[PDB]
Amino acid sequence: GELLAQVEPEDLIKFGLIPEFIGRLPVVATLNELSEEALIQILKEPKNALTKQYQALFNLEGVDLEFRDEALDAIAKKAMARKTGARGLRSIVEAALLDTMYDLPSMEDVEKVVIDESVIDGQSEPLLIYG
Amino acid sequence: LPTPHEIRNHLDDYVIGQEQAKKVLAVAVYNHYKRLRNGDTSNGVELGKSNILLIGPTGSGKTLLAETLARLLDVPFTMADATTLTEAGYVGEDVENIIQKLLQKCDYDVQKAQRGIVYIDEIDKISRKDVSGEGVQQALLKLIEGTVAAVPPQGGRKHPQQEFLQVDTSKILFICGGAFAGLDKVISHRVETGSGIGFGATVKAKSDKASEGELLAQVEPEDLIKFGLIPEFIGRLPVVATLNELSEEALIQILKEPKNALTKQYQALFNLEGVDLEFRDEALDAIAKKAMARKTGARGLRSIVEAALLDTMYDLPSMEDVEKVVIDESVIDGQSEPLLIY
Amino acid sequence: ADATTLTEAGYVGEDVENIIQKLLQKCDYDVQKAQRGIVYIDEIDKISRKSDNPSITRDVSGEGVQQALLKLIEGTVAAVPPQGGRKHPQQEFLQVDTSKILFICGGAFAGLDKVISHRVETGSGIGFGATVKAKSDKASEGELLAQVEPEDLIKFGLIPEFIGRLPVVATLNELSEEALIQILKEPKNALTKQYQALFNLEGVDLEFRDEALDAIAKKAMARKTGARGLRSIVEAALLDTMYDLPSMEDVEKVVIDESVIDGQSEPLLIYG
Amino acid sequence: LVPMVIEQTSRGERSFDIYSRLLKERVIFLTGQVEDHMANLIVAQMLFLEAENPEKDIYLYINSPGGVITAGMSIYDTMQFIKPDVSTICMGQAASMGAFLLTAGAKGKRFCLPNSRVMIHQPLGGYQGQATDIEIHAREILKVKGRMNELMALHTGQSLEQIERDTERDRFLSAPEAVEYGLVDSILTHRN
Amino acid sequence: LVPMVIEQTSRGERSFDIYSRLLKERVIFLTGQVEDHMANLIVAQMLFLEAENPEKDIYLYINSPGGVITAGMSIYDTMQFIKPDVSTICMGQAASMGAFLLTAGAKGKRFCLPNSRVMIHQPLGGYQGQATDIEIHAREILKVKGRMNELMALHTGQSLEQIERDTERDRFLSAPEAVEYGLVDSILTHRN
Amino acid sequence: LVPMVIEQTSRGERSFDIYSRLLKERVIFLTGQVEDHMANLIVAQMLFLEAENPEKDIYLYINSPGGVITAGMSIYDTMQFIKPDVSTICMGQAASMGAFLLTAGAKGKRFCLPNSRVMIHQPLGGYQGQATDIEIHAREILKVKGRMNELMALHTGQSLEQIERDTERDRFLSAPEAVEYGLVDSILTHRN
Ligand SMILES: Nc1ncnc2c1ncn2[C@@H]1O[C@H](COP(=O)(O)OP(=O)(O)O)[C@@H](O)[C@H]1O
Structure with missing residues (x-):
């Protein structure tokens, strides 16, 4: 700048x-270029936000979707490395949640889904609420 | 018809200095129009074209002079870069495209194009050492002396299934301008007597750049x-x-002396709202000094002034009861904001 | 025509056949008239090869142009569009035979004089063994x-x-002082005559002197600018004169002297 | 190793040696013992510059503890013969031959640095052989001394007797003393 | 052997030796014994850079166990003569002539490496011959010592008496000690 | 002689000597006795590489039976001054001065070949003349011994007392022994 x-x-x-x-x-x-804090706002502040889009899909299936501020920070950091702009955010989310959506409808007795920062990195798996 | 003095005074309103150069342009334009207007040629003698050559360093207002002359007349004007041009068989840039640009300015009017004043910029950087080099210039030979040139019918890409109009360049005046780097050194060896790199030899440490001009x-x-x-x-x-070239003193004149002066533009904008604007002499000199220090040129002057006024003009509409704005040296440096009168 | 613009077929550069197209424009697209027309070519030396004997790469601007002109100069049918291919069906491209079309080539050659001098230069060898002294004398370019x-x-x-x-x-x-001096006044559209007419229309008479022409000729050949250099000197001497000539009036004749060209004098004005 | 420098011109970049680059600007370097081989090189440089511009002055830098008198005569006679004025500057030191060529420059164009040293002495020579042969050689060295003094007196402007007395024995003149004695005209203490 | 480096420029790619490449950046190397040939080479490089741009400072790296005085004074007078400032840097060792030129740099632009050593000593010279000639040469070297000591005090800023006593005998000054003496303004240890 | 190599570039092929081609890859060769001329050549290469890329590492190959200390200190200070890390590799032999440069390499970037010899001994020097002059020169070398040992202990990591004891006499340390001593960080046997 x-x-x-x-x-x-x-x-x-x-x-x-x-x-x-x-x-x-x-x-x-x-x-x-947008910063780490700016990306966080863009992720949820817009009406047709990326997070809201996936939440609607999970809600349509009948399972709740939750996000963590710590995990969102890592997503913004990865986007900056790619320096692809706001559009790149969609790719990052799709890659982390690719395995989840593949087997999400298969599972039953699921009411809520929780995502951790480690899950974004790929080391951890998405947490599922059973009850 | 206007006399050379009329053009001189006109240019002086929008230009400061270049007395000798101004006389040349005025005489050439006056003589060229007389030849063009006297197309009948009552006498058996046939009049001949004349061309103009401009040599000056960068930021010398060469383009300004050409634009001012074109503005003062109703004939079309065109600007081009010689470096872009290439010989036939190369990437595709050709001298014919130059005439195409002129036609676009006059709405593809062949008659109007003949009276247009063509201009060339950055003639330097192309010369003898295959590469195009001097070959690009060779294509210009026939254009300067005068020749028919094929141009598309409506400024479209060359297609075999179409015809190309012919424009005679025998009446189109050509103004070739460019900044030469190192020519002064060659001239010095020819006319000046110095030992160059010597213990007792003169060196360009005095900082008197005026000698170069x-x-x-x-x-x-x-x-x-x-x-x-x-x-x-x-x-x-x-x-x-x-x-x-421009000097610190001359640069100060450009800030206020021209009709479309930088300071005058801001003053008109400020007084339009009802708040007076005053440019201190010290602040003006500092602005020119900053540009020369950073060698930004005449163009950079606008950015320097915009920095100080940007913050001021943002907060000025907020308050009321403002009578005058006084700019000082501190405002230019940015240490303190300009004071207001209430 | 311009030889530099010409290039081999199948390239962005101007085609050789376009030259014949220009001739048709003069005779209103008349094939018969063009068949007996005259064509002039300028700067033909530019297409000459520049140490391209090995032929490392084909030169469309150089050797290529010559090859295309081989059969054209001799005579052959040339396919040129009548009106730039008006319609695809029944195009009927004009066939203009150039067997009877005269061609004139012209160009300034740089270095050719040295080539001729080397051939004309004598001397079989160097040293005592040489039986010929190889004596030579300076000769003019012409x-x-x-x-x-x-x-x-x-x-x-x-x-x-x-x-x-x-x-x-x-x-x-080349030209000399006598040639340049005559060119300044003898031809109809001479340089001096052009300025006289430009001054006559404003009710002002102009006169020259033999001494002035001598300085003009010497300055022209001193700068090595050819005949075109004359205009540069003339306008430079009369710049200040015509810069203010329309301002005043009552002037009937103007006289130019040798000292005026040197820059230590000024033109003499005569008031009626 | 001699460093290389690039001279940028409109035609294009070219490479020249540091000494060669200065030669283009009419600057000749006189360094080391004076001999026939280096003198012919200086003589050629002078004649080459005369043809290029017989109106531009030439600058000669001298830094050497003297040398052969014969080689100096070829340089001295070459500077006085050519039309251009040859300027001489003393850098470091200037012995008998270095001083003779220093003062032999054009009047009003002779310079000396502030800490440079100068030295003038009579010709030193010897011969071995027959008494008759020694007589011939002895005469020449005496004649050379007389001719050298007269030339120094002409350029320096001092009387012939004064030059002979001063040159009889080793005499050292500093930069101010050189100006006072007329060996040089001024001292280029600073750029301006 | 001297390696060759490639420099990328807008006009194209050019190959220069390592020493010539640094010369473009206003850098000069002073290494080995001080003689008339190497000194005249440094002078040419200085004048060459002054013509290019006499506004940027020049950097001189000095590493030499002294040498002759006449060759050194040509460099000292040249550094003071030219308008731009000459920055002296000491790497390795710096004897009398290496120290006289090191301290002769522009004030505030003199540096020395941490482990580099400095040394200052009086002029060394000798002459053999007649008693009268011995007196002339003896006084000459003594005058050189006075001129050197005077200039040393001026640049160092120390009193003339201190310079004379310290330079009477070889004095090895470490980089920190040299700063106290005033030979060099600061010590360069790490970049930034 | 020196053989020439070809570097295949997108534009065209270039010809370089075997020593210049490796210089582009940030490789410097330290061969033969250490002196002012060879040391100043290495210093220029180090600075030239720092400008091209001040972040990449530099490799210094050392094979030499020692040499001058003053010429070496200019290399040591140059390595620690520049920002890039200087990697030192010992090929065949490393004497006292070579060993000092070898240990001076950045931490974690010091290597030695398996069949490599290292040697560490106190500085050697001698002076002749007056008794008073002998004492001052003796002080300089004693200071150098202390300064070298202090710096040696720092990089090596061994105590100063241990270094003084070991360096008192010639100590030949093999590649494995050198690792234990701490002069190097690892050994290169095969390419992985
Ligand atoms: N003599 C002058 N009088 C008025 N304005 C000038 C003059 N010289 C330069 N300028 C200003 O400089 C600006 C840029 O000039 P530029 O076209 O870069 O000159 P050049 O073509 O010589 O480089 C113009 O907007 C013009 O107002």
């Missing part, structure tokens, strides 16, 4: 852009 | 030949002009 | 070009078959 702040129209001209067009826009604004 | 005024065709340009192109351009 | 032969052109990078199509070869010479 620091490099973007020290940007001038000459830099754009060097890229191979006509100077006349660059002169029509005398105002420039800079942004920055 | 004066040296460029003594440019001759032989100097261009040493640069690597082929003698055909130098001969095709009979008129040559030199533009010096 | 003189060497007159002795040109097809063998010399081949070494420049031209195919022998190509030069064989041009039986007659004509050479040109």
Whole structure:
């Protein structure tokens, strides 16, 4: 982000852009990639949130779905490494929950599902509530 | 018709300095229009075209002069980069595309295109050492002297199942401008008597860059030949002009003297809401000093001023009872915000 | 036509057949008229080979252009669209035979003089054994070009078959002070005459002097800019003059002196 | 090893030796004992620059504890013959021959560094052989001394008798003393 | 053998020796005995960098067990003459001439490695011949000592008396001790 | 002579000497007696690599019967100064100076071949002249002995007293013995 702040129209001209067009826009604004905290909000704050989408699917099956703040932090960290943006978040969730959905309807006497941070990493398995 | 003095005063309103260069452009445009307007040629003698050559360092307002002349007239104007051009059989860029851009400006009007003023930028970086190199320039030969050029009917990709219109370039004035790096050194060896890298030899430590501009005024065709340009192109351009570089004093003038000045634009915006804007002389000098220190150029000046005013203009509409805004050196550095009058 | 634009078939560069298309435009797409037309080619030296004898890679801009022109110059049918392929069915591409179409090639050759000088240069060997002294004398560029032969052109990078199509070869010479001086006034559309007309329309007369032309010619040949350099010197001397000429009035005649060209004087104005 | 430097030009980048690069700027280096082999190299450098620009001055740096007198005469006569003015600068030290060539530069273009040393002494030579043969060789060394003093007096501007007395025995002149004695004109203490 | 390095530039790729590559970055190497040939090479490199850009500082690495004084003064006068500042760095050892040039750097831009050693001693010279000639040479070397000691005190900032006594005999100054003496401003141990 | 090799690049093939090709891979060769010329050459390579990549490691091969200490200290300080970790590998022999450089390698990046010899002995030197001059020179070498032993104990990890006792006389340590002493961290026998 620091490099973007020290940007001038000459830099754009060097890229191979006509100077006349660059002169029509005398105002420039800079942004920055989402951070760990920003990804957490984007994960649940929007109405059509990624977490809410999967929760509806689990609710449709009749099982409750829960998420942990610690696990969500790891997901944001992995997305930053991939630097694929918000869309990459969907891929991360699909990979961790791939095995779960495969055998989720097979199981019976299940009322709620709990996900741990270790489950996201792949070392642990998703916790299931039986009763 | 307008006389050269009229164009001089006009350019002076939007340009500061370059007196010699301004005279050349005015005379050339005036003479070219007289030839174009006198198409009947009552006398048996046939008039001939003339070309303009501009030599000046980067950030010398070369494009500004071309745009100002084009704005002052109703003929179409086009800007192009010589480096992009390539010889036939290469990736695809050709000299014919240059005429296509001109036609697009005049809505594919062949008659209007003939009266248009074509301009070339960054002529440097292409010269004799296969690679295109000088070959790209060779294609321009026929264009400068005048020749028919095939262009698509409606500015579309070349298709065999279509015809290409012919545009005669025998009446299109060409203005070739570019920044030459190292030409001053060649000229110095020719005209100046110095021992270069010597204990007693003069060195460019005095920081008097103004001398460089004066040296460029003594440019001759032989100097261009040493640069690597082929003698055909130098001969095709009979008129040559030199533009010096900007200085701290001159830069201060550009901030307020031009009609479309940077400071005047902000002042108009501020007084439009009812709050006066005052630019201290010290702050203006510091702005020019910062750009020269970082060699950002005339373009970078806008960004420097925008940094200080951005924060101020955001909070100004919040409060009321504001009469005047005073900018100081601290505001430029950012240590303290500009004071307001209540 | 421009030889640089021409390239081998099947490439982005302009096709050789397009040259014949231009000729048709002049005669309103008349095939019969084009068959007896005249064609001029410029800067033909650019397509010459540049040490491409090994043929490491095919040169579409160089040797390739020559090969395509071999049969065209001799004479053959050329398929050119009448109106850029108006309709696919019944296209009827114009067949323009070039057996009777004259072709004139022209171009400035750099280094050819040295090639001719080497061939003309004598000397079988070096040392006491040499029976010939190898005496030579300096010759002008025009003189060497007159002795040109097809063998010399081949070494420049031209195919022998190509030069064989041009039986007659004509050479040109450089210019001198007398030639440049005459060119400034003798031709109809002379440089000096053009400026006189530009000044006459404004109610102003202009006159030149022989001494001024001498300095102009010397400056032109001193800069090595050819005849085109003349314009640069003339405009540079009259720049300040015409910069303010429309401002004042009551001026009937202008006189240029030799000192004016040197930059230590100014043109003399005559008031009526 | 001699380091390499690249000179950037419009034509393109080229590589030259540090000594070769300075030669392009009319700078010649005189270093070490003076002999026929190095003198011919300096003479060639001078003649090469004269043809390139007979109006641009030439700068000669001298740092050497003297050497052969014969080799110096070829350099001295070459500087006075060519049209350009040859500037001489003393770096480190300048013995009899180094000083003779130093003061032999163009008037008003002779410089000396602040801590440079100068030394002037009579010709040193010897011969072994017959008494008759020794007489011939003895005459030449005396004649060389007289001619050298007259040339020094002309360039330095001092009287011929004064030069002979000063050159009779080893005499050391510092940078200020050199200016006072006329060997050099000024001292390039700083860039400006 | 000297290795060759490849430098990537916008114009293309060029191959230079290790010593020539560092020269582009305003770096000069002073190694071995100080003589007229190596000294004239350093002078050329200094003048070459001044012409390129006389604003950036120049770095001089010194590692040498002394040498001749005339060759060294040509470097000292050159460093003070040129407008840009010359930064001296001591690696290995630095004898009288290596120390005289080390302390002669711009104030605030003198460094020494932690284990590097320094040494300062008076001029060493001798002459054999007539009694009269011996007096001339004896006074000459003594004057050189005074000039060196005066300049040493000026750069070091120590009193002239201290410089004379300390330089009377060989004085091995460690990197920390050298900073106290004022030969070098600071000691470079780790980057950043 | 030195053989030439070819480096296949996407643009084209380049020719380099066997020693220059390995330099691109951050490999430096320390062969023969240590001196100022060879040491300054290694220092330049170390700095040149730090600029190209200040994060990758550097490998230093040592095979030499020792040499000068001052020339070696410039290499040691250069290794500890630069940010990259300098890996030291002993091939065949490692004398007193070579051993000091070998132990100076970064922790966990020190290796030696199985049939490799190491030697550690106190600094050797001599001076002749006046009795007073002898004493001052003796103090310098004694200080060097203490400084070398102190630094040796630091990197090796052995107590300073143990190092002083062992380095008092020549001690030949084989590759396994060297690991126990702590001069190295591991042994390379086969490629995994
Ligand atoms: N002499 C001048 N008068 C007015 N403005 C100038 C002048 N020189 C430069 N400028 C300003 O510099 C800006 C950029 O100029 P630029 O087109 O980069 O010059 P060049 O083409 O010589 O590089 C322009 O917006 C122009 O307002």
